[PDB]
Scaffold this active site. Sequence first.
Site, PDB file in Angstrom:
ATOM      1  N   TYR A   1     -14.951  -2.471  10.365  1.00 58.31           N
ATOM      2  CA  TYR A   1     -14.808  -3.240   9.130  1.00 58.31           C
ATOM      3  C   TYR A   1     -16.138  -3.858   8.694  1.00 58.31           C
ATOM      4  O   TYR A   1     -16.221  -5.039   8.330  1.00 58.31           O
ATOM      5  CB  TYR A   1     -13.707  -4.304   9.318  1.00 58.31           C
ATOM      6  CG  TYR A   1     -12.314  -3.700   9.257  1.00 58.31           C
ATOM      7  CD1 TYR A   1     -11.582  -3.746   8.085  1.00 58.31           C
ATOM      8  CD2 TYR A   1     -11.761  -3.046  10.356  1.00 58.31           C
ATOM      9  CE1 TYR A   1     -10.315  -3.189   8.000  1.00 58.31           C
ATOM     10  CE2 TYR A   1     -10.482  -2.477  10.287  1.00 58.31           C
ATOM     11  CZ  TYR A   1      -9.782  -2.549   9.095  1.00 58.31           C
ATOM     12  OH  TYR A   1      -8.527  -2.008   8.984  1.00 58.31           O
TER      13      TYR A   1
ATOM     14  N   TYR B   1       0.185  -5.588  12.113  1.00 62.45           N
ATOM     15  CA  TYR B   1      -0.944  -4.658  12.122  1.00 62.45           C
ATOM     16  C   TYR B   1      -0.561  -3.444  12.946  1.00 62.45           C
ATOM     17  O   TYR B   1      -0.051  -3.578  14.053  1.00 62.45           O
ATOM     18  CB  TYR B   1      -2.226  -5.299  12.684  1.00 62.45           C
ATOM     19  CG  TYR B   1      -3.374  -4.317  12.723  1.00 62.45           C
ATOM     20  CD1 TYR B   1      -3.996  -3.919  11.549  1.00 62.45           C
ATOM     21  CD2 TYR B   1      -3.801  -3.766  13.926  1.00 62.45           C
ATOM     22  CE1 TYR B   1      -5.039  -3.000  11.563  1.00 62.45           C
ATOM     23  CE2 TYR B   1      -4.862  -2.848  13.957  1.00 62.45           C
ATOM     24  CZ  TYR B   1      -5.459  -2.477  12.772  1.00 62.45           C
ATOM     25  OH  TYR B   1      -6.494  -1.565  12.818  1.00 62.45           O
TER      26      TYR B   1
ATOM     27  N   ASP C   1       5.726  -1.360  18.375  1.00 59.69           N
ATOM     28  CA  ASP C   1       4.298  -1.115  18.544  1.00 59.69           C
ATOM     29  C   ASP C   1       3.761  -2.067  19.602  1.00 59.69           C
ATOM     30  O   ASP C   1       3.506  -3.243  19.301  1.00 59.69           O
ATOM     31  CB  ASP C   1       3.580  -1.297  17.201  1.00 59.69           C
ATOM     32  CG  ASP C   1       2.116  -0.954  17.267  1.00 59.69           C
ATOM     33  OD1 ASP C   1       1.583  -0.856  18.389  1.00 59.69           O
ATOM     34  OD2 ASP C   1       1.499  -0.833  16.187  1.00 59.69           O
TER      35      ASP C   1
ATOM     36  N   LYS D   1      -4.102   0.096  23.863  1.00 63.28           N
ATOM     37  CA  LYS D   1      -5.408  -0.535  24.098  1.00 63.28           C
ATOM     38  C   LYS D   1      -5.778  -0.712  25.569  1.00 63.28           C
ATOM     39  O   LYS D   1      -6.917  -0.460  25.951  1.00 63.28           O
ATOM     40  CB  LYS D   1      -5.481  -1.893  23.404  1.00 63.28           C
ATOM     41  CG  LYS D   1      -5.574  -1.808  21.893  1.00 63.28           C
ATOM     42  CD  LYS D   1      -5.921  -3.174  21.317  1.00 63.28           C
ATOM     43  CE  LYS D   1      -6.356  -3.114  19.853  1.00 63.28           C
ATOM     44  NZ  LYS D   1      -5.202  -2.917  18.942  1.00 63.28           N
TER      45      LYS D   1
HETATM   46  C1  41N Z   1     -13.123  -2.716  18.465  1.00 62.14           C
HETATM   47  C2  41N Z   1     -13.521  -3.975  17.747  1.00 62.14           C
HETATM   48  O1  41N Z   1     -14.452  -4.654  18.128  1.00 62.14           O
HETATM   49  C3  41N Z   1     -12.782  -4.428  16.526  1.00 62.14           C
HETATM   50  C4  41N Z   1     -11.780  -3.651  15.957  1.00 62.14           C
HETATM   51  C5  41N Z   1     -11.110  -4.097  14.820  1.00 62.14           C
HETATM   52  C6  41N Z   1     -11.459  -5.323  14.258  1.00 62.14           C
HETATM   53  N1  41N Z   1     -10.784  -5.809  13.138  1.00 62.14           N
HETATM   54  C7  41N Z   1     -11.271  -7.024  12.514  1.00 62.14           C
HETATM   55  C8  41N Z   1     -10.935  -6.921  11.039  1.00 62.14           C
HETATM   56  N2  41N Z   1      -9.498  -6.686  10.912  1.00 62.14           N
HETATM   57  C9  41N Z   1      -8.947  -6.879   9.738  1.00 62.14           C
HETATM   58  O2  41N Z   1      -9.614  -7.377   8.836  1.00 62.14           O
HETATM   59  C10 41N Z   1      -7.539  -6.472   9.440  1.00 62.14           C
HETATM   60  C11 41N Z   1      -7.321  -5.218   8.874  1.00 62.14           C
HETATM   61  C12 41N Z   1      -6.050  -4.780   8.526  1.00 62.14           C
HETATM   62  C13 41N Z   1      -5.016  -5.660   8.765  1.00 62.14           C
HETATM   63  C14 41N Z   1      -5.223  -6.888   9.308  1.00 62.14           C
HETATM   64  C15 41N Z   1      -6.484  -7.354   9.651  1.00 62.14           C
HETATM   65  O3  41N Z   1      -4.018  -7.526   9.411  1.00 62.14           O
HETATM   66  C16 41N Z   1      -3.036  -6.738   8.726  1.00 62.14           C
HETATM   67  O4  41N Z   1      -3.686  -5.482   8.501  1.00 62.14           O
HETATM   68  C17 41N Z   1      -8.738  -6.238  12.067  1.00 62.14           C
HETATM   69  C18 41N Z   1      -9.585  -5.131  12.671  1.00 62.14           C
HETATM   70  C19 41N Z   1     -12.462  -6.106  14.825  1.00 62.14           C
HETATM   71  C20 41N Z   1     -13.122  -5.655  15.963  1.00 62.14           C
HETATM   72  C1  PLP Z   2      -5.237  -2.050  17.831  1.00 64.45           C
HETATM   73  C2  PLP Z   2      -3.868  -1.694  17.345  1.00 64.45           C
HETATM   74  C3  PLP Z   2      -3.487  -0.416  16.711  1.00 64.45           C
HETATM   75  C4  PLP Z   2      -4.529   0.656  16.440  1.00 64.45           C
HETATM   76  O1  PLP Z   2      -5.150   1.178  17.605  1.00 64.45           O
HETATM   77  P1  PLP Z   2      -6.523   2.010  17.411  1.00 64.45           P
HETATM   78  O2  PLP Z   2      -6.763   2.500  18.815  1.00 64.45           O
HETATM   79  O3  PLP Z   2      -7.500   0.980  16.922  1.00 64.45           O
HETATM   80  O4  PLP Z   2      -6.282   3.123  16.426  1.00 64.45           O
HETATM   81  C5  PLP Z   2      -2.168  -0.214  16.316  1.00 64.45           C
HETATM   82  N1  PLP Z   2      -1.210  -1.142  16.521  1.00 64.45           N
HETATM   83  C6  PLP Z   2      -1.461  -2.342  17.078  1.00 64.45           C
HETATM   84  C7  PLP Z   2      -0.379  -3.364  17.268  1.00 64.45           C
HETATM   85  C8  PLP Z   2      -2.807  -2.692  17.535  1.00 64.45           C
HETATM   86  O5  PLP Z   2      -3.066  -3.899  18.097  1.00 64.45           O
END
Ligand code: 41N
Ligand code: PLP
Lengths: 429, 429
Positions: free
Chosen positions: B18, B150, B247, B276
Site C-alpha cells: 500500500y 478484511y 476466514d 499467515k
Molecule cells: C506485509 C506487510 O508488512 C503489510 C501488509 C499489509 C498492510 N496493510 C496496511 C494497509 N491496509 C489497509 O489500508 C487496508 C486495506 C483494505 C482494507 C482494510 C485496510 O480494511 C478493510 O479493507 C491493510 C494492509 C501493511 C503491511
Molecule cells: C492477511 C489476510 C488475508 C490476505 O492474505 P495475503 O497472504 O496477504 O493474500 C486474507 N484474510 C485475512 C483475514 C487476513 O488477515
Amino acid sequence: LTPEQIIAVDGAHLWHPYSSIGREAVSPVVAVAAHGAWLTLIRDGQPIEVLDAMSSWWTAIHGHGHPALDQALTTQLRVMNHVMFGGLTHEPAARLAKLLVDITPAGLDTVFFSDSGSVSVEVAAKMALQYWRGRGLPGKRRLMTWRGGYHGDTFLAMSICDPHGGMHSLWTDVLAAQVFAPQVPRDYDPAYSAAFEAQLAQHAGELAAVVVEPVVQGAGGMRFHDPRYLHDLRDICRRYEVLLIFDEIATGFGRTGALFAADHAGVSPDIMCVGKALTGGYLSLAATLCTADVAHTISAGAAGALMHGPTFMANPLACAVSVASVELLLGQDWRTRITELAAGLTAGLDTARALPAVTDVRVCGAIGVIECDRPVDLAVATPAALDRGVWLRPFRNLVYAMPPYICTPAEITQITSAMVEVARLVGSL
Amino acid sequence: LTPEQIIAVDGAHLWHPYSSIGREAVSPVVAVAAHGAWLTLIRDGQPIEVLDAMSSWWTAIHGHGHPALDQALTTQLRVMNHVMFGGLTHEPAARLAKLLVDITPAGLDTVFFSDSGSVSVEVAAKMALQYWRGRGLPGKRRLMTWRGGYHGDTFLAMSICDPHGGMHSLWTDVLAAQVFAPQVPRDYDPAYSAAFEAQLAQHAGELAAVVVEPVVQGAGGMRFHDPRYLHDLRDICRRYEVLLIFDEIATGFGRTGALFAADHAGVSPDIMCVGKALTGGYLSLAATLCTADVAHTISAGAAGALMHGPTFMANPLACAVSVASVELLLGQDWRTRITELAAGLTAGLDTARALPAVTDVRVCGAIGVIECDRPVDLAVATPAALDRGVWLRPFRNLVYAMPPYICTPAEITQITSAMVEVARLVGSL
Ligand SMILES: CC(=O)c1ccc(N2CCN(C(=O)c3ccc4c(c3)OCO4)CC2)cc1
Ligand SMILES: *Cc1c(COP(=O)(O)O)cnc(C)c1O
Ligand SMILES: CC(=O)c1ccc(N2CCN(C(=O)c3ccc4c(c3)OCO4)CC2)cc1
Ligand SMILES: *Cc1c(COP(=O)(O)O)cnc(C)c1O
C-alpha cells in the site's frame, strides 16, 4: 508415511489442480525425490527414476536440487527467513529488483513482488485501473485480449482466460465481461491486426489495457504466434492510449529462446508479469513490473498509493533463491543452451508428423508440442510414458514437454521418444 | 549491497505494501537479520536489535530462525524441493493435510493448498459458487458479510472488505456488489443477530455464502466481537441454506487463545481459510478446507472438479516447514503460553487507559491494542518505538502488537512500555 499411507491420505483429504475429491480416474503417483532433471516416483511399490519433461509445470528450469540454488536458500536461512515488507526493506529484495529492472524489456523500472502468477496478474490490472483513475478517466476499466489465452485462476484473471478453454459457461453472471478478439493465428496476417485495431477502436474509451501472453500461449492450447503481432499491439495501444500488459509468467527466463518472449519483437509493454520459473522452481514467487510513468501516475492519484500488499511480499528466502536462479541463467550461454534444446526437440519429434492421429508438431525454444486429432487419455498416456522413463502429462489433445535447461541431448531424445510413443498409442485406441 | 545502496535501489525500484513510488514520507528501514523475537535493523548506519512486536505481520509465531523450523526446511531441501501437484502427490502434502483435517473444527475433511491468503479466499468463494451450481441453483452467487472486515487484495477478496477501509469509493463500477450487514458489535446483542438474519433472509436466494473473520477483525480495525455471534451465524446459515465461510488467515494457530477462533464459539464453518502463520512465518502458503458435503457436491457438478490449480500447489518446502511449525505448536502447552502472553499484554497496557488521547485498550489472546482518538503519525511513532528497542507499526488511530509466542515476560514488558509511550506521544501533540 509409506507410499500406500500417502495415497490413502491423499484420496480422502487432498484436492489436486482442477481435480475432484473421490472421482479421480487415476490415483496420483507418489513422488519421493527430485534431483537434477529426474524424479523418483513409486511405481508398483518400487522407486523408479524418470525425466521431468514438464519441468514440474514450467518451474524447474535449472533442474531440482541445484547446488547453487540449494546453497542460496540455506545461506539466507542462516540470517533472515522473513520480515514484513511494510516499513522495512532488505538486501534480497533490492538485489532481485535491480536484476529484474536490468534484464526485462526497456522502461520497466519498478517491481511489485507477490506470491503467485494469478496475484501478479490481478496486481497488473489494479495498476492499469489506478493509472487511468489517476488520469481522471475511470471509465477506462475493462480489459481486452485475444482468444486462446490463460492468465490464472483468481476471478479477475479468469475473466481474460479463453472463454471456451476456461469454461466460462459455468461462470455466467459471475465474471467481468471483457473484450475478446479472435484467436491470434500462427502465421502473420495484416488483416488480423487491422481487425484487432477496428475492434479496439470501438472500445478504447472503456479499455484500461490489452493483456496477452507474448509469442506462446500456454495453458489455453500451447499455440505459437508470429512476434510481429506484438509490434502491432504496441502500435495500436500507443495510438489509442490503452496500456499494454504482457503476461510472461510461463514464457519468462529463456523458455521461448529469448530471455523474455517480448524480446522476439523488441517490444516493451507498460506492465509485465513474471512467475513460474522466477525461483528456479523452488518456491512460490511472482512479480509485476511497470514503467516509471505508470508508477508516478498511480502515486500522484487519489489513493496516493497502489492499493495492494501481500503478507509475504518480497519474502527474503524466495527472493534469495530467485537472485541465484537468475544469476545462474545469466552467467551461462543460455541462448546457445536453449537453441540446442530446441534443435533436439525438433529432431526428435519429426517422426510424429507421419502418425495417423497427429495433426501438428511444433517447437519454440525449449517447448515441444504434438497436437493430436483426439483428446489424449491420461490413463493410457501417463503410464506409457513412465514405461519409457519419462514423466509426461498431456492436456486435451496435446502431448507436450517443456524440459529443464540442464537436460543432455540424450535426455532430450529420451523425452521426445516417449512423446512419439504416446502419440502412436493415441492413434491405436 | 550496503544499507545505503539498498535504500537507493529500494527508493527507485521497489513497491511496498500500500505504498507509492517516489512519494514515501519516510524511507523504509533496512533489515539485515532476524532471530527469535528480534530483528536487526540499520539505524544511524549501525545494526540495532529490536523486538518484532508485529510478528512480521502475524507470521512469526515461533520467532524467526527457530532451529526446528530451519531444520525441517533443510531436511526437505535435500530430498525434493518441489514437484508439480498435477498427477503427483507427496509426503509433506499428505502429512500437512492430515494434520490440518485433525486440528481444525469438526467436519472440515478436505484441503486445497494455495500460495496466499487472498488466493485461498478466492478458492473458498469458488467452492461456494460451484457448490450451489452443483445443486442447480446458479442464482446463489453473491456473498454476505459484516462491515469492518478484511479478506485480501485480489478483486473478489476486495469485494467483501470493509467499504471504507477498503477504499471502495476508488473502485466504483469495478467490484462485485456484495451484501453488507452493519459493523458487528463488541458486546453480544441478540438484536444484532436478529437483524443480520432478517437481512440475510431477504437475500437468501441469491447468496452463496456468508464470509467473516471469526472473533477478531484484523486489518479492518483490530476489533473484537463476542464469539456467540458466530454461533448465531452458523444457525442462520443452516436454517436459510447459505454456506458459512470463516476466514482464519490471521486468527489461526492459537493467536486468539484458541487453536482456531471458531473454537471460542464451538462452531464449524462449511469452508475455512488459513494462511499467515501456517509456515511459522518462513514461506508463502495458504489452505482452504471444506466439508465432505461441499467437496462431493462440487465433484458431482457439471465441471466434475474444482476449477482451480496454482502452479506451486502444495509445495514440498512450504508444506514441510508448516508440518514442523504445527507440530511445534501442538507439542507444547500453547494454551497456557497464550494465556500468559495475554496477561502480560493486559498488565503492560493498563496504564494507557488514563492517557488523554486513548479511547480504548483491548486484549484478545496474543493481541494487544491501544485505540486513540486521532491518527497516529508514523513519522513520530516508528522512531519513538525504535528508540525503545521495539518494532511497531501503527495504523490509523491504532497502536497494536501481536508478538511472537516465544516472547518472555521481560520482552512483553518492553513491547507494552513502547506502546504506552507511543500513545503518550499521540496525546501530547
Ligand atoms: C506485509 C506487510 O508488512 C503489510 C501488509 C499489509 C498492510 N496493510 C496496511 C494497509 N491496509 C489497509 O489500508 C487496508 C486495506 C483494505 C482494507 C482494510 C485496510 O480494511 C478493510 O479493507 C491493510 C494492509 C501493511 C503491511
Ligand atoms: C492477511 C489476510 C488475508 C490476505 O492474505 P495475503 O497472504 O496477504 O493474500 C486474507 N484474510 C485475512 C483475514 C487476513 O488477515
Ligand atoms: C501445478 C500443476 O501440476 C498443474 C496446474 C494447472 C493445471 N491445469 C490443467 C487444467 N487447466 C485448465 O483446465 C484450464 C483452465 C482455464 C483455462 C485454460 C485451461 O485455458 C484457458 O483458460 C489448466 C491448468 C494442470 C497442472
Ligand atoms: C501459470 C500461469 C498463471 C498463473 O500463475 P499461478 O502461479 O498458477 O497463479 C498466469 N498466467 C500465465 C500465462 C501462466 O502460465
